[PDB]
Amino acid sequence: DKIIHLTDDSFDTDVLKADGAILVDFWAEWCGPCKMIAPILDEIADEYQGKLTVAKLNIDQNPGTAPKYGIRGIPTLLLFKNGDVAATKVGALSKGQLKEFLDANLA
């Protein structure tokens, strides 16, 4: 619904050319922690509408994008502000932990 579903072709447009903040989630289907945080990312899209947009890129279906941001470990949450990484979070975390990360880097 409110979450952008990225591909390798849509990443520049959806992410790098966006006028505002976008939380990108680099994930895969076999990754248990990625699946842990997925419903938390749905809640965050709701609570932070007007402040931020959530986007997801699946690194198996789209294998070109991840090695440009040096990703070696999933889930990796990267926060962008007009196309530049502001903040990096590696591994699973809770709703409250993710909020705290957002509130402090939304800045």
Swiss-Prot record:
Provide this UniProt record's keywords sorted from A to Z. Acetylation, Disulfide bond, Electron transport, Host-virus interaction, Redox-active center, Transport
What are the disulfide bonds? Answer: C31-C34
Site feature location: Contributes to redox potential value: G32, P33
Q: Which family does it belong to?
A: Belongs to the thioredoxin family.
Which Pfam families has this protein been placed in? Thioredoxin
Name of the gene = trxA
**Gene Ontology biological process terms in this record:** cell redox homeostasis
One molecular function GO term is: DNA polymerase processivity factor activity
Lineage of the species this protein comes from: Bacteria, Pseudomonadati, Pseudomonadota, Gammaproteobacteria, Enterobacterales
Superkingdom of this protein's organism: Bacteria
Provide the positions where the record notes the PTM N6-acetyllysine: K68
Q: Record's SUPFAM superfamilies?
A: Thioredoxin-like
Q: Tell me which residues this entry annotates as catalytic.
A: C31 (nucleophile), C34 (nucleophile)
PROSITE patterns the record matches:
THIOREDOXIN_1 (PS00194), THIOREDOXIN_2 (PS51352)
Per the entry, what this protein does is:
Participates in various redox reactions through the reversible oxidation of its active center dithiol to a disulfide and catalyzes dithiol-disulfide exchange reactions.
Q: Which PANTHER family match?
A: GEO12009P1
**One GO term of the cellular component aspect?**
cytosol
Known partners and oligomeric status = Monomer. Interacts with bacteriophage T3 DNA polymerase.
- Protein known as: Thioredoxin 1
